């Protein structure tokens with residue numbers, strides 16, 4: 714199990730100022746529904762996966778300090794018709810991965826058997842839902858495949874999560890700085906775990 718190397722102590726050291734909504738036990742329990750997460754490839758692939766998932770989360774959530782996007786749009790994309798927006802509801806970032814947009818809440822809701830499309834606030838109000846959405850995105854959108862491949866691709870995870878805004882950005886621009894922070898956190902977490910992060914890092 715990945716919990717053999719990401720212990721409670723490792724997690725707490727990485728996220729010492731987390732909002733109490735987010736717990737190690739919550740992550741562990743939710744991860745049980747994604748048995749391939751953190752158990753795919755070599756031990757070093759498992760370590761890179763955890764570092765990549767949690768490094769991206771560190772960026773998105775501000776060290777797990779935030780549940781909701783700070784100072785958010787309602788993130789209703791009316792061109793995206795498969796998952797209809799609910800009147801008055803807002804699809805701004807929520808949970809560890811800052812799940813955003815009707816299309817993501819809708820697809821996650823369908824896959825998870827949860828009322829996320831009509832009640833997106835569940836992601837900020839139920840920590841089991843919050844962790845499940847982060848793992849859902851990681852697995853369904855195939856950040857998992859990017860990082861656990863030989864060779865690993867951390868850059869691929871950034872592209873999938875927020876590539877339009879963070880990849881292919883001028884050096885030093887806000888999106889580029891966000892991207893570089895993800896890389897910094899990933900590499901720091903890899904250092905904790907004693908694993909080489911690989912070379913395919915930035916986008």
Ligand SMILES: CC(=O)N[C@@H]1[C@@H](O)[C@H](O[C@@H]2O[C@H](CO)[C@@H](O[C@@H]3O[C@H](CO)[C@@H](O[C@@H]4O[C@H](CO)[C@@H](O)[C@H](O)[C@H]4NC(C)=O)[C@H](O)[C@H]3NC(C)=O)[C@H](O)[C@H]2NC(C)=O)[C@@H](CO)O[C@H]1O
Pocket residue numbers: 772773774775779780781782783784806810811812813814817850873874875877878887890891894
């Ligand atoms: C310089 C620096 O690093 N500053 C930090 C702040 O960036 C940070 O605030 C958080 O910032 C991130 C951007 O890095 C922001 O991320 C939002 O994340 C969601 C989820 O990934 C994105 O949604 C994606 O949208 C695309 C389409 O554009 C979809 O294709 C994709 O499916 C979506 N992904 C998911 C998982 O749903 C948003 O696009 C993205 N927003 C922007 C503007 O880039 C977070 O919401 C910010 N977090 C908070 C809590 O507000 C801040 C955190 O405290 O810390 C600074 O240091």
